[PDB]
Ligand binder design. Sequence first.
Ligand SMILES: Nc1ncnc2c1ncn2[C@@H]1O[C@H](COP(=O)(O)OP(=O)(O)O)[C@@H](O)[C@H]1O
Ligand SMILES: Nc1ncnc2c1ncn2[C@@H]1O[C@H](COP(=O)(O)OP(=O)(O)O)[C@@H](O)[C@H]1O
Ligand SMILES: O=P(O)(O)OC[C@H]1O[C@@](CO)(OP(=O)(O)O)[C@@H](O)[C@@H]1O
Ligand SMILES: O=P(O)(O)OC[C@H]1O[C@@](CO)(OP(=O)(O)O)[C@@H](O)[C@@H]1O
Ligand SMILES: O=P(O)(O)OC[C@H]1O[C@](O)(CO)[C@@H](O)[C@@H]1O
Ligand SMILES: O=P(O)(O)OC[C@H]1O[C@](O)(CO)[C@@H](O)[C@@H]1O
Lengths: 440, 440
Amino acid sequence: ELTQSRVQKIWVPVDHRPNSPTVIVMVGLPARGKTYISKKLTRYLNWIGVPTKVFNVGEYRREAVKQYSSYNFFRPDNEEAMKVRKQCALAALRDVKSYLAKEGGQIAVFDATNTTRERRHMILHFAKENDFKAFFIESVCDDPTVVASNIMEVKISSPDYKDCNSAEAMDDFMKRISCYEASYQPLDPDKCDRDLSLIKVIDVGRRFLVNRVQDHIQSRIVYYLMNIHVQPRTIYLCRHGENEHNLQGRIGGDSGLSSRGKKFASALSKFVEEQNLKDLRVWTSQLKSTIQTAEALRLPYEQWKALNEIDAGVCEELTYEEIRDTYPEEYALREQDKYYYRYPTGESYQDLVQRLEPVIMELERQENVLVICHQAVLRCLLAYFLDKSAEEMPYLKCPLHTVLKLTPVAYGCRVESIYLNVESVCTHRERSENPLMRRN
Amino acid sequence: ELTQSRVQKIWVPVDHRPNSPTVIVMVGLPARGKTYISKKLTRYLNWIGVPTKVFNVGEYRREAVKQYSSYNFFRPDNEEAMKVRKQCALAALRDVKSYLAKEGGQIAVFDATNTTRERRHMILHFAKENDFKAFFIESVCDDPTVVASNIMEVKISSPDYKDCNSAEAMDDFMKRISCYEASYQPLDPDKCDRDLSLIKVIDVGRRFLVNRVQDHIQSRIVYYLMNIHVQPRTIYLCRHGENEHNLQGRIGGDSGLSSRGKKFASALSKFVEEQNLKDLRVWTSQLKSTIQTAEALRLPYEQWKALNEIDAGVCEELTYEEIRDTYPEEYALREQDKYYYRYPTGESYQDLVQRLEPVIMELERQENVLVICHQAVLRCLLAYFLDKSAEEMPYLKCPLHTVLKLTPVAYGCRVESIYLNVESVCTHRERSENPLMRRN
Ligand SMILES: Nc1ncnc2c1ncn2[C@@H]1O[C@H](COP(=O)(O)OP(=O)(O)O)[C@@H](O)[C@H]1O
Ligand SMILES: Nc1ncnc2c1ncn2[C@@H]1O[C@H](COP(=O)(O)OP(=O)(O)O)[C@@H](O)[C@H]1O
Ligand SMILES: O=P(O)(O)OC[C@H]1O[C@@](CO)(OP(=O)(O)O)[C@@H](O)[C@@H]1O
Ligand SMILES: O=P(O)(O)OC[C@H]1O[C@@](CO)(OP(=O)(O)O)[C@@H](O)[C@@H]1O
Ligand SMILES: O=P(O)(O)OC[C@H]1O[C@](O)(CO)[C@@H](O)[C@@H]1O
Ligand SMILES: O=P(O)(O)OC[C@H]1O[C@](O)(CO)[C@@H](O)[C@@H]1O
């Protein structure tokens, strides 16, 4: 007969009491970007609501072996270490099983060189017997400058190399790489790996070989992998300059900038100029206050409906007081479950994620971008860049008049905050703190 | 200082008076799906708002050569026909130039075998000198059953074979294919075509080789190409059973089914059963009336916010009369420009396109799907399947209680309409038909 759920506003059938998880398998020599792709891809998947976890076999190794000493550990003749490495893989797999079949996880990224047919064949056997789909991602790169640079960026400052300097860490890791070169069997989609679902990423994403995509979530991953790059650049995020409803503690609406909001706009101009960016895309919402802010910059800017602020449904243009008083039950429900709560005839943070994915996907393709937007929206994008969970995302602090400047480092993003020194109200609201439903 | 445009509600700077177009190049032997990919890809691009046109060199040929007689026309020794074919290509290119540089077009799909380096090299020269990006799409398929089947489906009933039967049309076309086999040079991304942007579609999309995507619109095309298939299936589209606001001529809202809407639901059940589909996905919106309708079917169904009806902003739940009276100017603006018009704090048909693209993209991946939805939404999806322009889309007829059953045939979709014989109101509104602003 159907009832409308109170938080999400989803119609469900009144309950009057009387698909397959995926193991993603990274493949390739060390320092080929496997961990980087693993973390980044996991970041994306979790943010769009597909629960995903990285199993880095190296971290299992570091847990079972106290202190690393040298590449001798990795030699093919090292029978004891081969026993430990195998056991490390199997222990990681056990966890994958646990995570896909008992913990709610949907994708497990199995992050190891997985460079032999023998190793892949085993992983397949394990997928098969657990009823997991398997998908392979191989990074192929024999440009020595790339390999070298990669080693400098992430390898030499690993815990393996703690009591150790650059030149010898670098030298050791080059020998660890040679250990794997002898029996490395790349994916052969053309005959032997004919039936595997895989993508082979070649020359830092200059080229792809894609073979048998088998489902919604695989085709997404491929799309994503083909749009990210590693060129250096900067993402700036901030809100529209202070607006008039800000001044009255009113949510939503389409009000213009306060005189302070305008002073922020000029400062943002000054800030942009001093950053000395050769090019810079500017994006705004379609709400006036982000566009007026962009106008202060005298640069081409592009408006996106998707960046419009969360839609507060029938609460548009009310104060939170007015909300508490007219809709106390709604007000309380939003406080209980702020990520999933949807306003009546309006949206939840969950909805924002879904409209923002194409913004994120274009952010990934671009180089320098300034995105001028709104509180909830900004939280949602920041959660993606800083890997914040659904549960922390509605509460991230995203004040007015402040640029978040995001630069890629190692495996994620450095955030620097830069306030442009123009006052405004503060619209941040922290989380909020029953005897008579019990006998005592 | 900024003013809000009256139709689209876009903030633009008050005007107080004082990138590169793409040529897509199809590559491959005849009957490899080139025209099919060309038309389908064009259909997609236009619907998402990227203006795109197919230039089929064969149609130029049919215009310059009166009546086709046989494959002798295509022989490599046929010097006169080689002059005509070349001139046909160049004339198509002239049109491409005209379309990209003078007509507003953004993508031109150059649809010919384009099987030699010499031919591609020329096309490149032409792109270069006109400042067009160039992107190549090659279909490789040497499965004789596929080639044969393809010839049966689209070739034998071409105007070339008018006074001609199956067996000899088929025989002639196999020889036309052999004409091209001798100097066919496939794209070699591995050395000679190292610098071309291309995708090589292999074995009906079992496998892809992608090389140097260079922009937003290229990566989209690839994503799209990797999600379409050619397996036989059926798409059903219909509206929620009649609802209560329907009965009062009220737009929007979230009202439940009338007793007739419920009788439709049962009939839809009966209809689904008699279709005898081995599997069938069912999708609804998150509005009650589509979900109640799906409940009548007793099948798993999945709710999509993106399928929710167009949002009429501050007109939600008004009658069109109430709209005319309270917002005559809005009412008139919507009549002037119904595709682009956006309701205040609500949406336009343009917005629906953009929320619906992921629905379309998943429709392309699926097999049997029934989508139960709403008037404007249904128009938008139908426009994509039946290739209708922006301008005709807001006016397509999508009555209550009627299934549109879409089956792939040749180069697009057959539509059959099936009414389930339960009365309802009719919510269709046709298009609507100044001396005092002039001296006489
Ligand atoms: N497709 C790629 N090919 C080569 N290097 C890459 C790729 N993607 C990212 N990288 C680089 O790899 C480095 C991280 O290496 P890591 O992911 O730890 O390698 P691995 O896990 O293969 O040992 C980063 O410097 C990043 O720029
Ligand atoms: N990737 C593909 N490989 C082979 N055949 C395909 C592919 N995609 C579509 N087809 C089939 O091609 C047929 C249409 O052929 P057409 O597009 O006119 O070929 P061409 O233009 O290469 O002569 C349809 O039957 C369709 O099923
Ligand atoms: O199981 P194999 O194929 O050895 O790969 C796991 C090993 O890969 C290594 C090799 O570098 O990766 P990582 O850089 O991920 O720490 C080892 O640390 C880890 O023990
Ligand atoms: O310029 P080329 O490479 O000959 O390709 C154009 C020719 O391709 C053909 C070969 O079949 O395609 P179509 O099937 O598109 O009509 C000819 O009709 C057309 O004249
Ligand atoms: O989810 P929160 O914390 O209530 O913040 C969202 C609000 O912030 C604003 O951008 C300005 O306060 C409102 O328009 C929006 O409703
Ligand atoms: O664009 P149109 O022709 O006004 O039709 C859209 C309307 O149709 C309905 O689905 C029902 O009439 C309304 O909810 C919606 O506003």
